[PDB]
Scaffold this active site. Structure first.
Site, PDB file in Angstrom:
ATOM      1  N   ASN A 213      -0.554  -5.154   4.328  1.00 18.20           N
ATOM      2  CA  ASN A 213      -1.602  -5.870   3.613  1.00 18.20           C
ATOM      3  C   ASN A 213      -1.836  -7.255   4.227  1.00 18.20           C
ATOM      4  OD1 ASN A 213       0.756  -7.242   2.466  1.00 18.20           O
ATOM      5  ND2 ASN A 213      -0.666  -7.975   0.891  1.00 18.20           N
TER       6      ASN A 213
ATOM      7  N   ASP B   5       0.118   5.922  -4.464  1.00 23.31           N
ATOM      8  CA  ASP B   5       0.644   4.566  -4.587  1.00 23.31           C
ATOM      9  C   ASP B   5      -0.473   3.563  -4.840  1.00 23.31           C
ATOM     10  OD1 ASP B   5       2.779   2.449  -4.266  1.00 23.31           O
ATOM     11  OD2 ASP B   5       1.555   1.947  -2.511  1.00 23.31           O
TER      12      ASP B   5
END
Ligand SMILES: CC(C)(COP(=O)(O)OP(=O)(O)OC[C@H]1O[C@@H](n2cnc3c(N)ncnc32)[C@H](O)[C@@H]1OP(=O)(O)O)[C@@H](O)C(=O)NCCC(=O)NCCS
Ligand SMILES: CC(C)(COP(=O)(O)OP(=O)(O)OC[C@H]1O[C@@H](n2cnc3c(N)ncnc32)[C@H](O)[C@@H]1OP(=O)(O)O)[C@@H](O)C(=O)NCCC(=O)NCCS
Ligand SMILES: CC(C)(COP(=O)(O)OP(=O)(O)OC[C@H]1O[C@@H](n2cnc3c(N)ncnc32)[C@H](O)[C@@H]1OP(=O)(O)O)[C@@H](O)C(=O)NCCC(=O)NCCS
Lengths: 304, 303, 303
Positions: C13, C191
Site C-alpha cells: 500500500n 481480505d
C-alpha cells in the site's frame, strides 16, 4: 450495479488521481456484463457482447485512491443488432461516508457468436416503461448511425506538429478473456495516455480530462499485433482543447494482412484554476489545409 | 544469493514460453539483492546496489509456464565502486522432476547512497579463494572499463526494412520506491523491440541466443516517455545482431532535452525443428553509417 | 520447501506495508509447489495440487517494501486424498540484515489429474520421524473433516451498517495456465472486502490479525463474475471477526445458477495513529441469526 472495486495505487497516474483508462475499463466491464447477460436471456446461440462505441464519458468529479468505485449499468435501448447501455460511476469514501457521482457514460455493444467469431446475432428486445423513452432511444440510435457516415515536421509553438505525439505498444497476452481478442480497456488506457501527453505538451500547465466524446472500435486487435496510438490536437475553444487519438494495428511479420485502423476517439481536456474553474488555454493555430479542415470540424462538434 | 518463483501465464511471451523480459527481471533482482546485501555488509552508509551493466546473458534453453525458476547469484569480483555478479537461472519441472540450466549471465552493479543519491559509494572488498580468481576478475573489470571508452521507403533485407520502435510512457508501477524505474521494465521493452526487428527481417520464428551489452547510462524517472528503437546491425550466415537504444524525453519541460538512458546488443537466431541454427537472410547496408556499424558488428563477432 | 522474492511497490500500500493478499498468494504458491512435487514423486498420474483449505494464517509482524520474503513449507500430514502443508513467511531486510518471522499458516491441498480434471487422486504417504507426529496429524485431519460437516436503512454499529461486498469480473491475469483462477487473487479480494467492512465499522486504520477458515468449495472458471460479500459476526473488546463469502454466477451461460465458491473468517484489529491497537466498538446483534453467528464467533474466538 454491475462492478464494484477498490482503487489502488497502480490505478492512478503519477500525480495521484485515478487514471482515465481505469475508469474506462470499469465502464466497459459493467456495460459488457449486463449486455452479454441480456443477449442470452432467451437462450439463443451462445454469444458475448463486444463494445463497439463509447458514445460519451463525462468526468464529472475526480476519483482518488482508497475510495470504492460502484459502477452501475442500465440497458436503455436495443436495436436490431446493437444495445445502448448507460453507466454511472460513483466514488465512496468508506470512512468519511461521502458518495459523489464521478463519471457518467453511454456505450454501444453488439453480440458476437462464440462458435463462429465475427458473426453478429440479433439483440433480443427490451420492454420500456414509457414510449417516449423508446423513441428517444431510437432517435439517439439514428443520430449515432448518421454520424458514422500523419507526418510531423519541425515544430513552432502552438502548432499541431508541436503537440502531436505517439505511443507504440506490442499487444501481449489475454489468457482469461471471453474471446481471443483483447479488451478495449488496454487500448483505451493507451488512448487516454496519448491524449494526456498531447494536452500537457500543448498547454504547459496542469490538465484534466473533461470528457471522452466518441470512441469507435473499427475492428478487433489480436495478440501479436503492434499498435500505434497517435494523438494530435484538432480544435481548441478559448478554455478547452480537443484531441483526436487514432489506433492503428500492424502485424509484426504477417504480410498476409495489411496495417489497418483499429480505433478512433476524441478527448476534450481542460485546465482548471486553484478554485476549480476552467482557465484559458493557448489557442491552436492550423497551418496546412487538412489541419484547418479538422479544426473546422472540431468547432462543428463543439456547437452540436 | 537465491530467488525462486513459479512461471505463470502473465510471465510468458506471445509463443507461450517464458518471456525474455521476465528472465532478465529475475536476473536483475537476484544480482541486486546479493550485491545490496554485500554493500551494506560493513555497516557503512545505507546504500542500494543499482544495475549498471549486463555483461552477458546466454539463453541456453527455454523455460515454460508451470516450471519453477531458481535464480542463483555469486559475487565474482569487486572493484573500487562496482560489483561483478554471476547469475544462473535453472528451470525445474515439478511433475517430471527435470531441471535444466536455462540462462547464464554476468552483471555489474554500483552502490548508490540512499541518503544522498547520485553519490557513488565504495564497495566493501570480498576475499577470494585463489589469487587467480581475483586476477581474472580484475582482467574482466579492466576489459569492460576499456570498452566503454529515420527510415525512408525500404528495400528488403536492409536495415530500414527491419528497423522498428516502441514508445512507452513511464508510469507508476515501473518505478521503485524512489522515482527511478527498475532495469526490468526497460530490458523487457528492449527484448520486445529486438524480437520485433528480428522477426521483420527474417520472416520466420526466431529465438534470442544471447544479450550482449546492456548499459544503463542514466536513470529514468516517472513521467518520462522512452523510445526503445531497434535496428539490425550485422548478420552472420546463421545469426543476427540487433542494436537497441533507449531514449528518454521529458513530456512537459521542453527546456530539458532528450537523453540516452540505455543501450544493448541482441543476438537472434532462427532454428530448425531439430534445434540447430539455420541460415538467416543476410543484411546489406546501404548508407555509410550502416556499414560502419556492420563492420564493428563483424568485429564483435570475431571476439 | 522454499520460494523467495523481493517485495515491490505493487505488493504494498501507500504506507509501504505489503498487502495481506500478496502474502496469502505467496503462501498458496509455496504450498502448491511442494504439494505438487510430492504428489508426482512416485510416478503416478500426472497431477497438480490445488488449494482447498487455509486452516489458519497468522500475521505476526508486518512486512514492508524492499524486504525480501522467504517462504518455507513442510508437508505435515497426508490423508488418502489430501496433503497438509505448514508454511512460514520470513522477511529479510538486506541493509540491516535483520530477519523476522512475519507470518505462519497451515493449508490443505488436493491433487487433481491434469488429463481428466475433477478427478481426485490418492496422495502418496509420507514417513514420519515420530509416531506422535502422525497421530497429531490424524487428529487435526479428522478435526477439519468434522468441522466441514440485504441491508436496509442502517443504525450505527449494527451488522447492516458495516456489511459490504465487492463485484469482480474474472480478468486476464487472474487465471492459471488452465481456465481456473488462483486462490491468491480470490483471497486478496476477500481480505480487501473484510478490511472495507472493518474500516466502515471502526472508522480508523485497521490491520488483519489472522484469517482462519478459508474453504475453496468449488472452482471458478474464466467468464464468471464473483461477489465477495463480507459481514461482521462477533467483536471482542479489541478484535473483530468478519465472515466473507464468495459467490460466482456465469455471465454468458444463463443455464447455470449461482454457486458458493469460497468462505473465510477474517479477524481484524484497530490501530492508533501512533500504531497502538485501540479498543474497537462492540457489534450489537439484532436478529436471531445475527445473535447465533455472534455466539458461534465467540466460540471460535475461545479456541
Ligand atoms: C463491432 C463490430 C463487430 C462491427 O461489426 P460489422 O463488421 O461492422 O458488421 P455489422 O453489419 O453488424 O455493422 C453494423 C451494425 O453493427 C453495430 N455497430 C457497428 N458499428 C457500430 C458503432 N460504431 N456504433 C454502434 N453500433 C455499431 C450495430 O449493430 C450496427 O447497426 P445495426 O443497428 O443495424 O445492427 C466490429 O467492428 C468489431 O468487432 N470492432 C472491434 C470491437 C472490439 O474491440 N472487440 C474486442 C473486445 S472490446
Ligand atoms: C550506472 C550509473 C550509476 C553510472 O554512474 P556515474 O554517475 O556515471 O559515476 P562514474 O561513471 O564516475 O563511476 C562510478 C562507478 O560506477 C562504475 N560504472 C559506471 N557505469 C558502469 C557500467 N555501465 N558498467 C560497469 N561499471 C560501471 C564505474 O566503473 C565506477 O566504479 P569504478 O571506479 O570501480 O570503475 C548511472 O548510469 C545510473 O544511475 N544508472 C542507473 C540505471 C537504472 O535504471 N538502474 C536500475 C534501477 S535504479
Ligand atoms: C477441493 C475440491 C477438489 C474437493 O473435491 P470434491 O468434489 O469435494 O471431492 P472430495 O471432497 O470427496 O475429494 C476427497 C478429498 O478432498 C478433501 N477436501 C475437499 N474439500 C476440502 C477442504 N475444504 N479442506 C480440506 N480437504 C478437503 C477431502 O477432505 C478429501 O480428502 P480425503 O478423501 O483424503 O479425506 C473441490 O472442492 C474444489 O475444486 N474446490 C476449489 C479448489 C480450486 O479452486 N482449485 C483451483 C486453484 S485454487
Amino acid at each position: 450495479i454491475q462492478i464494484c472495486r477498490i482503487m489502488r495505487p497502480d490505478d492512478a497516474n503519477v500525480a495521484g488521481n485515478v487514471h482515465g483508462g481505469t475508469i474506462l475499463k470499469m465502464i466497459e466491464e459493467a456495460g459488457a456484463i449486463i449486455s452479454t447477460r441480456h443477449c442470452n436471456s432467451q437462450n439463443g446461440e451462445r454469444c458475448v457482447a463486444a463494445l463497439a462505441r463509447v458514445e460519451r464519458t463525462d468526468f464529472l468529479s475526480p476519483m482518488c485512491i482508497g475510495e470504492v468505485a460502484h459502477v452501475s449499468a442500465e440497458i436503455t435501448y436495443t436495436s436490431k443488432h446493437s444495445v445502448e447501455v448507460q453507466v454511472h460511476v460513483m466514488s465512496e469514501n468508506i470512512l468519511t461516508g461521502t458518495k459523489k457521482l464521478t463519471n457518467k457514460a453511454t456505450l454501444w455493444y453488439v453480440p458476437l457468436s462464440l462458435k463462429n467469431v465475427d458473426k453478429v446475432l440479433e439483440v433480443p428486445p427490451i420492454v420500456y416503461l414509457r414510449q417516449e423513452q423508446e423513441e428517444e432511444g431510437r432517435k439517439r440510435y439514428e443520430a449515432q448511425k448518421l454520424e458514422r457516415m500523419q507526418p510531423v515536421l519541425n515544430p513552432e509553438p502552438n502548432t499541431v506538429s508541436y503537440s502531436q505525439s505517439s505511443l507504440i505498444h506490442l499487444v501481449g497476452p489475454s489468457d482469461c478473456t471471453l474471446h481471443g481478442f483483447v479488451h478495449g480497456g488496454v487500448t483505451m488506457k493507451l488512448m487516454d495516455e496519448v491524449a494526456g501527453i498531447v494536452a500537457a505538451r500543448h498547454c504547459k500547465t496542469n490538465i484534466v480530462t473533461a470528457s471522452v466524446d466518441a470512441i469507435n472500435f473499427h475492428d478487433k486487435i489480436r495478440k501479436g499485433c503492434v499498435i500505434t496510438i497517435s494523438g494530435r490536437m484538432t480544435f481548441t475553444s478559448n478554455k478547452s482543447m480537443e484531441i483526436e487519438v487514432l489506433v492503428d494495428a500492424d502485424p509484426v511479420v504477417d504480410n498476409s494482412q495489411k496495417r489497418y485502423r483499429a480505433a478512433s476517439a476524441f478527448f476534450t481536456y481542460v485546465s482548471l484554476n486553484q478554485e476549480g474553474k476552467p482557465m484559458p488555454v493557448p489557442q491552436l493555430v492550423p497551418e496546412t489545409e487538412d489541419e484547418k479542415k479538422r479544426f473546422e470540424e472540431g468547432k462543428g462538434r463543439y456547437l452540436q
